[PDB]
Amino acid sequence: TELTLKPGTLTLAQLRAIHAAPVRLQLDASAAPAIDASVACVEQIIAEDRTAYGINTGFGLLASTRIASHDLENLQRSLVLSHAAGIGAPLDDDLVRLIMVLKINSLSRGFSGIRRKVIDALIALVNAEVYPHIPLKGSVGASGALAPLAHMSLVLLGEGKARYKGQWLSATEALAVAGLEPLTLAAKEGLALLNGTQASTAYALRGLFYAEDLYAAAIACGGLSVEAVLGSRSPFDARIHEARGQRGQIDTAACFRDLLGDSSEVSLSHKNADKVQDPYSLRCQPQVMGACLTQLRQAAEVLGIEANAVSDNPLVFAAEGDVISGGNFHAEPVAMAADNLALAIAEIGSLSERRISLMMDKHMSQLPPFLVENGGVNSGFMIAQVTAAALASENKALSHPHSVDSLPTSANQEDHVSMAPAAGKRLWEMAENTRGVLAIEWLGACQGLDLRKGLKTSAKLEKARQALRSEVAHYDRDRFFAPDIEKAVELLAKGSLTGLLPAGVLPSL
Template identity: 60%
Template sequence: MITPGAAKLHDLRDILDGGALALDPAWRGVVRDSADGLARRLATGVALYGVNTGFGKLASTRIPPDRLAQLQLNLLRSHAAGTGPFLPAPVVRLILALKAMSLARGASGVRPEVVDALLALLAKDVLPAIPSKGSVGASGDLAPLAHLSLVLIGEGEAFLGGRLVGGAEALTASGLAPLDLAPKEGLALLNGTQVSTAIALTGLFAAEDLLKTALVAGAMSVDAARGSDTPFDPRIHELRGQPGQIACAAALRALLAGSAIRDSHRVDDPRVQDPYSLRCQPQVAGACLDLLRNAAATLLREANAVTDNPLVVGEGEVLSGGNFHAEPVAFAADTIALALAELGAISERRLALLTDPALNSGLPAFLVADSGVNSGFMIAQVTAAALVAENRALATPRSVDSLPTSANQEDHVSMATGAALRLATMAENLAVILGIELLAAAQGVEFHRPLRSSPPLEEAHAALRAVAARWDEDRTMAPDIEAAKRLVEHGAFARLVDLPA
């Protein structure tokens, strides 16, 4: 049971994964009070933006009472101008939940029936077909939310049982009736940051799991290269005091604890220090962890926020503001992108180290016997490098790229939706990069047999070998990379890591 305004990150992840949404029933009274307050205010005849006026640059145009319902319908229809591939079903589920929770705060002037209609779509798994492109992140996610809202009134398109059907058919097949919009309800549905927030949260959850996977890959690479665990000593990290760094060092220590490979070269090892890609993992991954935790706090606040305009407060006072401006979401998405790019960059450097006989402490060139006849991991490293370069380009901040819209009335926008959308591509690229590193590290560890790595790293090794055989001679590499990527995306390695808060 979620109280609107008090959802937790695990609640949101659960909804994304297909969990049900149940709201504390107390929301109904505050929403009704807000709708009643708006009705009283409207009856005075005062101009209320988007209620009895036009929108954006047309805000000074008064709308007569007999056309207020048409105003809301026209808003939904005219603003459904999105393009591009449809958003994935899990993201649409989260958008529906976020919009319902926001309106259930009782500050938007909508009737309880609007929240009920959103909850019904979610409960019946009627998922509006929402084009992914067309929002600049202010005034909210107008185009994508318009496509969502059309289904509520029996228009637009929706996915029902995985099949794309018309909005009216989707409602009828699910036993739902179209919603008749009252004044302001179309605007309340369209105005808000729920689309950009849901997409960014999806990227955040993927990044959190990928960071844990990067620690597993990095720890296994340390053993494959016969590296040192001294750089993970807690005394080093306590002296710096960066919380993410401290947590990642602790995770790396736990992953390497009990490794016979590490114990085999504690004495009389002529190497003094490892390269940065091994030695500075806590500093790099820890900085990424701090970024992700800060982004998580921002996105959780936004997920619980009321972000439409105008807002209805107190006894019906109507306040015009700008909570729809998604700058916090854009900044959060940009920082998640930076973390994804850096985790991939240092992973590829570890991979390059493992394949280079000048750096890998005695492993064969490109991690394969009979190098020359066999090329081993040579081109797999090239693939990783290509994806690192792509992620670097994608990590360019979107939040600084404002363009004015609506005849310069909306003269500064956040670009939050675009900032969030690229996270899925970056996460997929990183899953491939880490999958290749894990394959290479598993190959490297096997050259140290009969010595064993630590229990968690041997578990990771076994998971890889269940889908990809040891590389004894050249074969097609792509199936192994795809299999490792699937393990990464399904959390097979992330579950091995416990990150202290």
């Protein structure tokens, strides 16, 4: 997938693509002038013997002291070497890549004052599929992607290590792989590379994509459970949704009618489609899932903007010759988006679990008192029904927001931070919880529909049944179930059901 990048125009779709697979990129020519221009600004500042913080001053107490021009190259290197004090397991190549591409997009907007040749270097590591070692922990989402970003730049200066073809090489052997040589940095270039919200942004983005995949899956899964228990379609009537006027819900109901259709053999084979009321977990799916869609749409907007943001410091405005110190490196926005996404992920998992319970019960579904065929011979999946409770419950605590916490770092000058990295990181596990839950819904609904011998559900829903059944057989009775769940989870993770959702509903899809 070749991209000709025009900085700051990244869409969430492209971001999905970048997160998902290898990317080949090159810059758009419209890019060259602003980048090159911001460098000449920095360059003339130096030459006019002027002194500017972030450009040619020292740091802290010395933030006021000029650094010998020839002293400047060692500053960079000291900055990079010093900040790589992260901790944890190393990010998978996917996230690295994404972060690499986000930093590139960001620098290339020509507000950062670093040479194109340095940007060009990053791009070359991207194109070569060489991914610098980045550890999961250390950043508080304020003062630049500081460790993760430092760990990234290490390889550029022939330091640290990088992964290639799944093997750890040296920052040197790997630079060569990319057709490069160890690089030396100039004024501002140290602060340009190490500062930004890219790490936290990639974390939050992965969570959004995850939240997105679960959403889609949940519409297919909730559609089967409606059928499995011979539920109504009336809860999906467009008019009820337009009368509430909630868009998330409006679009969600629409998605539901699309997948279920006006009726099915299954649905048609039950006298009427009204009688007894359906339980909230069925009936209020548009409302709840609808609320969830809104949530993930709000975050997506914030995150869509941040992915193209000029997030370093200080920023250089070559047109006016100004260099300004701000705080764009503060990822509060991103943190809140991550926290936002937590609620949607949890509540999708919550609703699916109650549908599982419904299904297993001696009614809430209208099938076997457990699906199997007697609580006394065996006792089917009342149990997988327990596993989903355990996963759903977890997400309740994981929902605790991180954007409200903060610790005064490095001498109460850095007296308020975001915690965006942790806000976002936790969504990944939250999505695993919700994914196992749905998988169990998926397996349960298909088991149940199965019991309704020879009957068929909607066209999209029969596709969802077949997707499962292509890899997991009907579990009609006593035998080790864990491996069914395990398999269902994978298919979900491979986006098995994603294609059934109508297009343009989800931000990145």
